[PDB]
RNA sequence: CUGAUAUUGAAUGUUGGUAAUUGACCUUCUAACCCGCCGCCCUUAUCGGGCGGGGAGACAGUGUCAGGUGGGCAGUUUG
RNA sequence: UAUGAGUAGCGAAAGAGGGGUGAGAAUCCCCUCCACCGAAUGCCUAAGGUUUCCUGAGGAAGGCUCGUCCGCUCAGGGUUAGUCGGGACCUAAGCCGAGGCCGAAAGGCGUAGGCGAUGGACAACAGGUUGAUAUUCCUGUACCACCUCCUCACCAUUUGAGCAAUGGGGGGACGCAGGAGGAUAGGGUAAGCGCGGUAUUGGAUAUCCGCGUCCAAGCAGUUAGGCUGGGAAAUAGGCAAAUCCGUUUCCCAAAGGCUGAGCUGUGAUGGCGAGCGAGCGAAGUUCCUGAUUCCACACUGCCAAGAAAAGCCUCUAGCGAGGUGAGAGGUGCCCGUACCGCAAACCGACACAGGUAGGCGAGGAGAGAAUCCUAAGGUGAUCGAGAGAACUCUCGUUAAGGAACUCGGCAAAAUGACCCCGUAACUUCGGGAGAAGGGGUGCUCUGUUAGGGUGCAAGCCCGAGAGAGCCGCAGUGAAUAGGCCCAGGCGACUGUUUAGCAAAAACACAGGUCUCUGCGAAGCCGUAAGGCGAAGUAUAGGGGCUGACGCCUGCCCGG
RNA sequence: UCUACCCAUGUCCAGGGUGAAGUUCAGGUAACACUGAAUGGAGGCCCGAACCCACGCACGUUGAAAAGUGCGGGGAUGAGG
């Protein structure tokens, strides 16, 4: 599989922005991607050194638009901590 | 007072779930009937 | 001996127990234990097929040597132990070659006694021989019906059978019941009365003690309703009110003989009880 | 529960029609059938099967037919 | 869509005022005092729910009123793990079940083998931090498994180190009760120490007042202690083999090991810490008390005789030319993680007086988790304002009388704690019995009594029984806490039962008796296979009747 | 998933009392019996919270609740929850 299949998009929030001060980058990842695959993919794509990857699953949020109930997608969020001697993403 | 429905997801699945239904002829007729009626939910 | 408790409560009044004088250890041989779950009188369908069975104390099975097939190797009685699975006590035998087995404890037997199986053994309490080798009038127990199958008859506390005569292939044996019966002369028996002879005198004393032994209450038929039992119903108390007393399944239950007519073993039964 | 008959064979006397032929009965045999007995093997298996012993044995079990019993259960009647 | 009707109701509970916000305020926010829970109405956490969590905005509907608010609407946001719980580990009941057995069909049963926690096994702790997660992030300090580009030491290349089973053995491995220890958590703040304060209501620099008064896993050491006796030789057994286990013989007798709460040191030149004001930061000891926890089912006793399997250890069978140990470097996946969880978020159609397993559960007085008042902490309850009629409900009191009431003392009243005295018939000799009936009970001084615990002492803690006084209507001054007796029927007894109109004299029961059952038992379930009975075997099992115990249990076999 | 019974595996039960067998010592006898004291800690034992139950009354009866609440009540180491 391609590394760029693994990382989907960056998470841009206040929390994510605060973690970037600590050299921690938050990505949404493929819901099938284990944290080793994420580590490998971040090093491959961005040419950085990864200290650790923490990873969590979000359920879909129930949603309404008028008379139609449904569900947002499940998400897998990875917080990637780079090593202290490393280039920034 | 203890009422009759005491929820428990394991027991729900084991008694009424898809694999329970599939494990007997009569459970497979339930699924056929519910597909025939066009139910959105075939099983617990 | 039987220990009578003092009437310190209504529960305890009349209650008696074994003193367990014969028992020499409190700990069974771990290598001869096997697991034993209760069944509640329920069969493979999960249905109750025997009434009044349920609960009671958890028990481990002690694997008894009913076959007595270590011929010629002497064994020393190491213990006499409580067995929860049967009325008799059991004896751990240390065989000379390092094998350990349990046997039914005969009346008399002592720690240190040597026992021996096989056709060239003495007629001593605790030995086991083919019935062709046992003299007439010998009191025996743990009698086989099929060569090699193991002892089936006369195993309960205090029971005994006497060898009456020899008819070549068969030996006559008076069983505990008093039935005289032909047994194949190749079938083994063990010498002596089974021990724990006082077992029958125990007064259980209270309802709860029956419950500890896995007995659930018996409800009489005559206090059931007609849909439950032939004796059910009637306004107020009623007599049996039927030609015969009846079982719950509508057979006569007082005098009606239930041994199968055309039983194959009828030829071997000389005198019925 | 009981009989007949099939599965079901081999001998031995015995006693009914028929002086030499057929039924009934008793006993014995083993080879069918049975084994909730033992050893071995398939096999890491208290299932099953095979093989060898042992027990039992033409009985039992089972099929068909028959009589008895049978509120255990069923359908009903009880102007 | 009416009527009933502006009626019944608005679902247990303490608020008051000041300030604010706003179109609008009893109801939202803040402040102050007051009040309620406190073996919970607190903290944690199941199951279940599934975003209800946080922030900002909103007010149509939902909310029994209102609403600026909200578990509601709309936007955004929020759940971080080698070590926690689950999986990549183990098995129980049970379930599935290759072949197989049985059966009109469908199927039923069942072996090997699996699945299956509610159990077994198993490596991380303290502190800090966000609006919203935290043994998960951060800091500090660890541990476990595995790997080898490397380093060092050691051993050995076929009488050859080492590894070693999917096999053997050991172990894991187990009940209930009781009491003694040892310890710790927790508690008291007793002493000491530290910081702050000296009052304006008469008094107090005082035996004055308030607040605080420590700390992990890990590593090293030690320990109350608890378990086991130990060596050598020989071996009809442990499916094969064992140098292991079992057995025996001989020798020796306190050694050995195996565990062990906790403690000491280190961890910590750190952290926390009254308070001062994100920072900064004092003292941080001793004494007393003390578990329902731990050592630990350890011990003792008892009968009703108390899972399995793996991890683990060991043994050989094997494998085997490279191994073993210690560093150093490195690797470590998935699932859950928000929030509610005695509740307005779960089960009850409701923001419903009901139900909901488990862990922790402070102080005073107390035997106590009772009780009353409080702590930590939580809460003031989603309609209000008046008025203070009948009547109804829940409470309090009541002259004289005291069951006259009534089917019936129903209801209520009375009794009630501790210590002491004393206690009948009858009895199965246990009981009856808290029988009954009486007495004492506060406070002060003697007095830090005698005496006891702890300690080297100082001290702290427990503490009779006396004597002398003092006060009240009343001293277990509140809350909580048996009414008792005489005689009879029924059932011996503790139990059980008509969920939701019957708790009983009914059922059960221990005991009695009859009867069936010789083991492929009888009986029972099933068409059968297969089962229960029972891994039982006549001192056992099934069925009927009777129902502790005592004395007894007559006559009739014609039906 | 309520409920009846059963099976496997967990767990809960503040406190207080009474004082069975046994044991020890003393006495006691030719031996035993037997007696006393201490010890000991039995029990479907006792009192009593949690918990479980549901006896009486009142209230409720278009309920706060399609079985409850209040005040009393019973069991509370067991045939227990
Ligand atoms: K009794
Ligand atoms: K009965
Ligand atoms: K009747
Ligand atoms: K309370
Ligand atoms: K708002
Ligand atoms: K884990
Ligand atoms: K640890
Ligand atoms: K330490
Ligand atoms: K969390
Ligand atoms: K009844
Ligand atoms: Mg995670
Ligand atoms: Mg019975
Ligand atoms: Mg009836
Ligand atoms: Mg009938
Ligand atoms: Mg009748
Ligand atoms: Mg009558
Ligand atoms: Mg009929
Ligand atoms: Mg009809
Ligand atoms: Mg009006
Ligand atoms: Mg009005
Ligand atoms: Mg009106
Ligand atoms: Mg009115
Ligand atoms: Mg009104
Ligand atoms: Mg209200
Ligand atoms: Mg909120
Ligand atoms: Mg409104
Ligand atoms: Mg785990
Ligand atoms: Mg099956
Ligand atoms: Mg098949
Ligand atoms: Mg579990
Ligand atoms: Mg762990
Ligand atoms: Mg939170
Ligand atoms: Mg949380
Ligand atoms: Mg509620
Ligand atoms: Mg409960
Ligand atoms: Mg308290
Ligand atoms: Mg009056
Ligand atoms: Mg008066
Ligand atoms: Mg009157
Ligand atoms: Mg009158
Ligand atoms: Mg009354
Ligand atoms: Mg009664
Ligand atoms: Mg009762
Ligand atoms: Mg009722
Ligand atoms: Mg009930
Ligand atoms: Mg009632
Ligand atoms: Mg059968
Ligand atoms: Mg069986
Ligand atoms: Mg009766
Ligand atoms: Mg009677
Ligand atoms: Mg009579
Ligand atoms: Mg009791
Ligand atoms: Mg009680
Ligand atoms: Mg009550």
Numbering used by the authors:
A (entry chain T): 2 to 90
B (entry chain 2): 1 to 44
C (entry chain C): 2 to 274
Task: Kindly provide excerpts from the paper associated with this entry.
Arrest peptides containing RAPP (ArgAlaProPro) motifs have been discovered in both Gram-positive and Gram-negative bacteria, where they are thought to regulate expression of important protein localization machinery components. The ApdA, ApdP and ApcA arrest peptides stall the ribosome with a peptidyl-RAP-tRNA located in the P-site and a Pro-tRNA (for ApdA and ApdP) or Gly-tRNA (for ApcA) in the A-site16. The PTC of the ribosome is in an induced state with a fully accommodated Pro-tRNA, thus, the stage is set for peptide bond formation to occur, yet, the nucleophilic attack does not take place. Our structures and MD simulations indicate that the nucleophilic attack cannot occur because the nitrogen of the Pro in the A-site forms a hydrogen bond with the carbonyl-oxygen of the Ala of the RAP motif in the P-site.
The ApdA-SRC was applied to cryo-grids and analyzed using single-particle cryo-EM. Focused 3D classification revealed two major subpopulations of 70S ribosomes, one bearing A- and P-site tRNAs (43%; 142,978 particles) and one with only P-site tRNA (46%; 152,257 particles), collectively representing a total of 89% of the initial ribosomal particles. The 70S ribosome with A- and P-site tRNAs was further refined, yielding a cryo-EM map of the ApdA-stalled-ribosomal complex (ApdA-SRC) with an average resolution of 2.3 Å. In the ApdA-SRC, the ApdA nascent polypeptide chain (NC) was well-resolved near the PTC, such that nine amino acids, including sidechains, could be modeled unambiguously, covering the C-terminal conserved 120RAP122 motif that is directly linked to the CCA-end of the P-site tRNA. In addition, the high quality of the cryo-EM map density allowed the Pro123 moiety attached to the CCA-end of the A-site tRNA to be unambiguously identified and modeled. In contrast to the RAPP motif, the conformation of the modeled residues located N-terminally is distinct when comparing ApdA and ApdP, which is not unexpected given the lack of sequence homology in this region. The three N-terminal residues (Lys128-Ile130) observed for ApdP form a network of direct and water-mediated interactions with A2062 and U2506 of the 23 S rRNA. Similar interactions are observed for the corresponding region of ApdA (Leu117-Asp119) with direct and water-mediated interactions observed to A2091 and G2534 (EcU2505). Unlike for ApdP, we observe an additional three residues (Arg114–Ala116) of ApdA that establish direct and water-mediated interactions with U793 (EcΨ746), C1811 (EcU1782), C2615 (EcU2586), U2638 (EcU2609), and A2087/A2088 (EcA2058/A2059). A comparison of the 23S rRNA nucleotides that surround and interact with these five ApdA residues (115LALGD 119) in the ApdA-SRC with the equivalent 23S rRNA nucleotides in the E. coli ribosome revealed no discernable conformational differences that would provide an explanation for the species-specific stalling.
